[PDB]
Known about the structure:
The complex is a heterotrimer of chains A (110), B (126) and C (388). Chain A has 110 residues and is an all-beta fold.
Amino acid sequence: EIVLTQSPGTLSLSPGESATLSCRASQSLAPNYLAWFQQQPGQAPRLLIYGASSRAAGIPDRFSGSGSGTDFTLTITRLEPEDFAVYYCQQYGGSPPYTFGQGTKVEIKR
Amino acid sequence: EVQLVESGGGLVLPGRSLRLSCVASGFDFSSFEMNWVRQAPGTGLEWLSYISGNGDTIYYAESVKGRFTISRDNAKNSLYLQMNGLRAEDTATYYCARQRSVYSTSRSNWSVFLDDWGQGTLVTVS
Amino acid sequence: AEYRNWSKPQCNITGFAPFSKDNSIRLSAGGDIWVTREPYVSCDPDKCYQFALGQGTTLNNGHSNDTVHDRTPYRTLLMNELGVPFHLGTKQVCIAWSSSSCHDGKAWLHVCVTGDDENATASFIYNGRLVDSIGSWSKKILRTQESECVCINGTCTVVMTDGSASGKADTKILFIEEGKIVHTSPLSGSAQHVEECSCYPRYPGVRCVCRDNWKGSNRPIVDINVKDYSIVSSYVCSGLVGDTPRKNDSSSSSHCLDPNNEEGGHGVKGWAFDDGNDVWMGRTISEKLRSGYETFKVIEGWSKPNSKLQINRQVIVDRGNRSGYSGIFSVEGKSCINRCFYVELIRGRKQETEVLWTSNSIVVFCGTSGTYGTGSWPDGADINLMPI
Ligand SMILES: *[C@@H]1O[C@H](CO)[C@@H](O[C@@H]2O[C@H](CO)[C@@H](O[C@@H]3O[C@H](CO)[C@@H](O)[C@H](O[C@H]4O[C@H](CO)[C@@H](O)[C@H](O)[C@@H]4O[C@H]4O[C@H](CO)[C@@H](O)[C@H](O)[C@@H]4O)[C@@H]3O)[C@H](O)[C@H]2NC(C)=O)[C@H](O)[C@H]1NC(C)=O
Ligand SMILES: *[C@@H]1O[C@H](CO)[C@@H](O)[C@H](O)[C@H]1NC(C)=O
Ligand SMILES: *[C@@H]1O[C@H](CO)[C@@H](O)[C@H](O)[C@H]1NC(C)=O
Ligand SMILES: *[C@@H]1O[C@H](CO)[C@@H](O)[C@H](O)[C@H]1NC(C)=O
């Protein structure tokens, strides 16, 4: 079973900066089966990047995915106030336990 | 537009049964795979169940395997989640998600993901 | 010698030209020729080699009687140059009722599975010596591609299956360097039953078109990343399906993400490869039996689901002649990688009750960028002239 582990459990950034979120798979996972989801505190999850590298429709070029095998990364350059949410990496399509990551909260640093 | 509306939920007692309904609109229901994802309050997303376009292929999470049962009616464009033996750990907002596939001709191997999520339904077991 | 990399692009394919034919069954009526099944072609940098799973006996032999069983202790992997029939001077390189052979540019790697069905052992013989071995992990019939594996930069990948032949099976992709298993990746993706893959180098990775014995008459695709050992899996998009049994052309379908559930309860070893968005695929002309063989290109058959616009159809074996396993093998050209395929021409028992043996011949076709004609190249052996 692919177990995903997001390294920065909680992230403290500032608007206009660049945030790097990482997802680590227990075994080698194809990029095709990793997706990044952003969830606001009171909204449904929203798909940002599918295939670990390709932005979803309507997603600004702010978000950029990368990685393959066991290491996957999510890059949010030029952060904005709406980009401070909980980010989940999900393995879907590879092995039947399509589990999500534990989540990564991006906070405004002061 | 593609929309999924989750029904059911409310308040139930432990050990009871419930039947959530996810009614799809805006796409051919039989052509896409359906998933159930729940989020406990204060906890991250948890994937529960998967069903294929014809219902032959079905997967369950270890937590809800044996208790829950996913089903779909392609004529009614509805996705069902029949829960049995509910416990306090089953209190969560339940999301109905549709699988989407994009070819990615650079790789040529059909990236697969969950794209369209409903607003969810709150299930409380107490 | 240097490690073979397959970095050249795929050659332009307008069709396939005849390349080789062994006439094994015709020669068996007048000589000592091995009884063989499940052949495949694999090439070293200089020349191509025949491979077959011999039955431990010749055709004009009392031991050739009842040679239809898949797994016997006497089955060995036979190896000689393409075009040389499997005579008494043939080399049996290993004991195997399941096999897979590849050349990395330096030495031959042979993956050979033998032993008990429930406790099979796969031996990994590289450069003529045993380097590694594995046991059965599902305690069912452990098997391999029955075709050539692919080595990229010294890393050979082999697809092994262990489990039910009519249900869920544990398919693992084994990454091998100089005979040593350096990694093992379970099958991940949309394919629900993968076995008997035809793997070709699609640089920088490996693409395998496999056979679904459980639920699909459409052929599973396995994309193997030989660097980070990641596996993606789907099905061939063309609505003209290459597995037999199958539905007819007007009722068959495929949607690239699940088995079509159209006479998918069995299968045959076959092949397919992508030419851009199109797919070049070969299949038996008969939808039910392994009789005849045809190759064609489906326009957008690799990218567009349920594509049925076929072109460049070639009859390799006509309707009235038995075909069998088919598979792909790649040849490094001067400037591009050429896709070549072989067809096994099974003869004998379980269809032909005139003889007690089950053997086969092979006919090899290589992709060509030029023109070609028509013709049929069957087994050509009169079953009434063969020894019983
Ligand atoms: C699948 O294959 C694997 C790999 O081959 C099998 O695993 C091997 O299994 C064998 C047999 O079980 C095992 O060898 C035994 O090891 C024991 C100690 O670990 C030995 O005690 C035992 O020797 C006794 O049994 C032999 C017959 O099996 C006798 O010939 C021998 O003389 C011994 O018998 C005397 O001693 C015993 C104990 O003192 C006593 O009770 C007797 O009465 C008698 O006095 C075997 O040597 C291997 O170690 C296993 N190897 C591995 C790597 O696991 C597996 O079993 C197979 N499974 C199936 C289902 O087929
Ligand atoms: C061939 O094998 C069968 C089954 O093992 C046996 O009954 C028969 O006597 C053998 N010989 C011939 C000539 O059929
Ligand atoms: C092959 O692998 C070796 C390391 O083992 C190294 O030279 C390089 O990564 C690869 N070479 C080429 C030409 O791809
Ligand atoms: C096979 O027969 C014809 C094609 O020749 C087709 O109309 C028919 O539907 C096919 N059979 C099935 C079961 O679809």
